[PDB]
């Protein structure tokens, strides 16, 4: 307790010396080690937020949804259950030998388990199925919101551009999945994130473009609805508010995830932005039924 008596001394700059594969010395500061632990804990916080939000949305959707077995109900249930299962496998990854400070500081491939390789492959498969369900939901949203109009030339063009962006995002996520899986099965200390960044920007641009299309088409439906009377707050205004939310808030969270400082674990903010792009539709159905029965029975 010699420096415990000392009032002023900085243990964050104090130096841990430990053994590693790169060299016997391998000096590090406590700031770098707590950077690692804080990034892991921040990932754990955001994935707990994701898992709890998706799980309670699944429970409330099982309780308060009028018409089950509708296609958008099944797509929402599949996407929320894939967020829960992805978050569960990511919890299994964060408490394991890949994310540990045993491997993140000492590059020892002996600690890497092949069961963890199976966990990695399952996580990439569940991620590809998650992006597939998200693009299925948004392509269904455009393909239903463009029905009814009598000039099916701008509508067919925008529906086809949306389907193109969706197929491109799902194919790029699958390319990232197999391109990471074969290399991880080959070499446990290698990765490929440029395809991952391309697929993330494709997902963010798909959400932003289909939300722009839904916002413009719902504003035109609101202005064409005001021509027929019908100036009350109704389900179309609920859809416009939730689509403007899924236009503005996840795009801002994607911009923040690409904007904030690296090596802080804030890069998994893309999972909160995709979470809100998922949750735009169940909350819109909840609000729409819970203000439609209100306006039409009370």
């Amino acid at each position: 307790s010699n420096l415990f008596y000392d009032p002023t001394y900085n243990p964050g700059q104090s130096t841990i010396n430990y053994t590693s594969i790169y060299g016997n010395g391998s000096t590090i500061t406590f700031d770098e080690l707590q950077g690692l632990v804080n990034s892991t804990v921040t990932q754990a916080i955001m994935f707990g937020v994701r898992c709890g939000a998706a799980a309670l949305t699944l429970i409330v959707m099982w309780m308060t949804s009028r018409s089950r077995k509708t296609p958008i109900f099944i797509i929402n249930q599949v996407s929320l259950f894939l967020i829960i299962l992805h978050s569960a496998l990511y919890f299994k990854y964060l408490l394991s030998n890949y994310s540990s400070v045993t491997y993140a500081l000492t590059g020892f491939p002996q600690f890497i388990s092949r069961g963890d390789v199976h966990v990695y492959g399952a996580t990439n498969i569940i991620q590809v199925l998650l992006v597939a369900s998200i693009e299925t939901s948004l392509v269904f949203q455009i393909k239903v919101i463009f029905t009814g109009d009598n000039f099916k030339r701008i509508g067919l063009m925008l529906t086809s551009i949306s389907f193109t962006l969706g197929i491109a995002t799902v194919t790029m996520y699958f390319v990232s999945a197999v391109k990471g899986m074969i290399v991880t099965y080959n070499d446990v200390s290698a990765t490929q994130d440029k395809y991952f960044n391309a697929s993330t920007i494709l997902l963010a641009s798909s959400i932003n473009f289909m939300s722009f299309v839904l916002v413009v088409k719902l504003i035109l439906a609101i202005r064409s609805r005001r021509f027929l009377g019908l100036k009350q707050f109704d389900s179309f205004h609920i859809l416009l508010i939730m689509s403007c939310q899924s236009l503005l808030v996840p795009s801002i969270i994607f911009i923040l995830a690409y904007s904030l400082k690296p090596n802080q674990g804030t890069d998994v903010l893309t999972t909160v932005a995709t979470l809100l792009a998922v949750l735009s539709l169940p909350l819109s159905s909840m609000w729409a039924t819970a203000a439609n029965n209100a306006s039409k029975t009370n």
Partner: peptide, 13 residues
């Protein structure tokens, strides 16, 4: 600004 980074054994976010 920073391109998103995956750690060597990290899965896809």
């Amino acid at each position: 600004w920073h391109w998103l980074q995956l750690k060597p054994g990290q899965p896809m976010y």
